[PDB]
Symmetry: D2
C-alpha cells in the first residue's frame, strides 16, 4: 500500500479504538495499525524526495516508525489482556509520535 | 520482497556486522536488516500456510518480528554512538530471536 | 528515595532539558531521570494504599513506569548522538506519560 | 536492596519460571524479577567502583538493565495473556542478557 493509504489506515483505526466497545475491536484495529506501520517502513515521504535512502534525514524519518511500531506492539498486549481502557489510553498517547513526525516531515 | 530473500538480507548483514572494522559498516548493515524485518512483517511462512492471518499462531509469529525490530532499533543507536563493540554484541544477542522463531516456525 | 522526592527529581530535570542548549546537559538530566524512574518502581501511591500489591491498579501503576523508563532510554540515545532538539522533543513527548499516570493515580 | 540480593531474586525467580505449572506462577515470578531489576538500576558493581559514575562502563552497565527490564515487561504480558510456554521461552531467553552483563562486569 502507498504511504498515504497506510496513513489513512493508521488514522481510521485510531478512531475505531477511541470509540470501541470491547477488546476484540481494539485488538483488530491495533493489528491493522501494526501492518500499516510496517508496510510504511520503506516509503519516501514527499518532503524528502531529493534525499537518498541512506541519507541522515531518512534515518531520522524512519526512527519515528520504530517508535510507533513499539507503541503499537505494547498497546496490543494491553488489548490481549482485555484492558480496554488501558489500551485506549496507550493509543491516545501514541498520537504524540504521529504528530512529531508530521510536524517535522509532512 | 519474499520471505526467503528477506531472510537472506538478515543473514548476510549479520555477518557483515560480525566482521566489520568501523561504525559506518555496522550502521549500513543494521539499516538493511531493519528494512528486511519490516518487509517480512506480513509474510505467511511455509509451515503456517494452514493457519489464518488472525490466529494465535500468526500473532505469535509476527510477535517475533516486533522483538527483532526492537533489537535492531537499539543496536543502531549503539552504532550511531560509534559503540561498535557494543553494537556487535547486541547483534549477537538478537540471534537468539532469529533462532527462537526458526525453532518454532522454520 | 520516596515517591515525592523521585517526582521532584523527574520534574527538576525535565526543566533542565527544556532549558538546555547542549547535549551534555540533556544527557546528564536524562540519566538522573532514569535513576529516579527506576527508584520509583516499587512505590505505592497514597491513592492505592488500600489496594493489593498484585491488584490490576498496582500492575497498571507499575506499567506507567515501564513506559517512562523506555522513553527516557530512547531519548538518552538521541542525546548521546548529539541530537539535541530531537532529545528535547522526546522529553517533551514523555510528559504525556507523566500526565496519564497523574490523572489516574495522583 | 543491594546488588547481590537483587541478583539472588533474579536467579531464584528464573528457576521458578522454569518449573512453573501455571500462568499465575510465571506472572508472580516475573513481577518479582521486574522489581529486583529496577532496584538494581543504581548499583555500582565491584568491578566498576573505581570508574566514574558517568564512565562508558557505568553507562553500559546501566544499559544492560534497560534491556533486561524491557524483556521482563514483555514476558509479563505473555504470562498475563496465559501464554505460559511463550512466557517461559521469553524468560529462559533472558539469560542472553544476564550472561552478557556478567561476562563484562561480574
Ligand atoms: C500515527 C498513528 C499516525 C497517524 C494517525 C497518521 C495519520 C496521517 C494522516 C491522516 C495523513 C494524511 C494522509 C493524506 O495525505 O491525506 C498522514 C500523512 C503523513 N504522515 Fe502520518 N500518521 C501517523 C504516524 C506517522 C509517522 C510516525 C510518520 C513518520 C515517521 C508519519 C509521516 C507522514 C507523512 C510524511 C505524511 C504525508 C504523506 C503524503 O501525503 O504522501 N506519520 N498521516
Ligand atoms: C535474525 C537476524 C534472522 C536471521 C539472520 C535469519 C536467517 C534466516 C535464513 C538464512 C533462512 C533460510 C532462507 C532459505 O531460503 O533457506 C531463514 C528462514 C526462515 N526464517 Fe529467519 N532469520 C532471522 C529471523 C527470523 C525471525 C525473527 C523469524 C520469525 C519471526 C524468522 C522466520 C523464518 C522462517 C519461517 C524461515 C523459513 C522460510 C522459508 O523456508 O521460506 N526468521 N532465516
Ligand atoms: C514524568 C517525567 C513525570 C514528572 C515530571 C512527574 C512530576 C511529578 C510532580 C512534580 C509531582 C508532585 C510531587 C510532590 O508532591 O511534590 C508528582 C507526583 C506524583 N506522580 Fe509524577 N511525574 C512523572 C511521572 C509519573 C508517573 C509515570 C507516575 C505513575 C506511573 C507518576 C505518579 C505520581 C503520583 C502517584 C504522584 C503523587 C505522589 C504523592 O502525592 O505522594 N508520576 N509527579
Ligand atoms: C538475569 C535474569 C540475571 C540473572 C539471573 C543474574 C544472576 C546473578 C547471580 C546468581 C549473581 C551472583 C549471586 C550472588 O549472590 O553473589 C549475579 C551477580 C552479578 N550480576 Fe547478575 N544476573 C542477571 C542479570 C544481570 C544483569 C543484566 C547485570 C548487569 C546489567 C548483572 C550484573 C551482575 C553483577 C555485576 C554481579 C556481581 C555482583 C557482586 O559481585 O557484587 N546481572 N547475577
Ligand atoms: C481477553 C481478555 C480477557 O480478560 N479475557 C478473558 C479470558 C482470559 C483469562 N485469563 C486469565 O485470567 C489469565 C490468563 C488468561 O487467559 C479474554 O479473552
Ligand atoms: C560517529 C560516532 C562517533 O563517535 N563519531 C565521532 C563524532 C562524535 C560527535 N558527537 C559527540 O561526541 C557527542 C555527540 C556527537 O554527535 C561519529 O562520527
Ligand atoms: Zn507493556
Ligand atoms: Zn539502548
Ligand atoms: Zn530510538
Ligand atoms: Zn510483546
Amino acid at each position: 500500500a502507498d504511504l498515504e493509504d497506510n496513513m489513512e489506515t493508521l488514522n481510521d483505526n485510531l478512531k475505531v479504538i477511541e470509540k470501541a466497545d470491547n477488546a476484540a475491536q481494539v485488538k483488530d484495529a491495533l493489528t491493522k495499525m501494526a501492518a500499516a506501520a510496517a508496510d510504511a517502513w520503506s516509503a519516501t515521504p514527499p518532503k524528502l524526495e531529493d534525499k537518498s535512502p541512506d541519507s541522515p534525514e531518512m534515518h531520522d524519518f524512519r526512527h519515528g516508525f520504530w517508535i510507533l511500531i513499539g507503541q503499537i506492539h505494547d498497546a496490543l498486549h494491553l488489548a490481549n489482556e482485555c484492558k480496554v481502557k488501558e489500551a485506549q489510553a496507550a493509543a491516545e498517547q501514541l498520537k504524540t509520535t504521529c504528530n512529531a513526525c508530521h510536524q517535522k516531515y509532512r
